[PDB]
Amino acid sequence: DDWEIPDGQITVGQRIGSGSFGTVYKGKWHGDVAVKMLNVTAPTPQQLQAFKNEVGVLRKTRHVNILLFMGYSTKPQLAIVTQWCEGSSLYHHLHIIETKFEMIKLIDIARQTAQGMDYLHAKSIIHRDLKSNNIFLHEDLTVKIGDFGLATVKSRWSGSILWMAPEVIRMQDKNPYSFQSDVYAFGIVLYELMTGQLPYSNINNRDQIIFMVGRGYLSPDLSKVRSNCPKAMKRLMAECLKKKRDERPLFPQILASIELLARS
Amino acid sequence: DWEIPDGQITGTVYKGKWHGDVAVKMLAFKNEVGVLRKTRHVNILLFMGYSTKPQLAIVTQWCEGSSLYHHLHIIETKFEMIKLIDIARQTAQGMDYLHAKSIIHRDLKSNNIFLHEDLTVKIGDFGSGSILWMAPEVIRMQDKNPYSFQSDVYAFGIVLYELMTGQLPYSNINNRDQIIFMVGRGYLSPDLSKVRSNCPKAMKRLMAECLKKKRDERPLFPQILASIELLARS
Ligand SMILES: CN(C)S(=O)(=O)Nc1ccc(F)c(Nc2ncccc2-c2ncnc3nc[nH]c23)c1F
Ligand SMILES: CN(C)S(=O)(=O)Nc1ccc(F)c(Nc2ncccc2-c2ncnc3nc[nH]c23)c1F
Question: Which part of the chain is the Protein kinase domain (chain B)?
Answer without folding.
Answer: 9-231
